Homo-oligomer: A and B are copies of this chain.
Amino acid sequence: CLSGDHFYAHMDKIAAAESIFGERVVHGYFVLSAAAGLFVDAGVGPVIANYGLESLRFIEPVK
Contacts and interface: CB of A to CB of B under 8 A. Distances in A.
Contact of A49 (B6, B20, B30, B40): B20
How many protomers of this protein does the assembly include?
4
Contacts of A37: 3-6
Interface residues of A, number: 42
Nearest to A59: B52
A55 B57 contact: no
Contacts of A12: 44
Shortest 6 CB-CB contacts between residues of A and residues of B: A4-B37, A53-B56, A3-B33, A52-B57, A6-B42, A3-B37
Contact of A8 (B6, B8, B43, B55): B43
Given A29-B29, A36-B3, A52 B42 contact: no
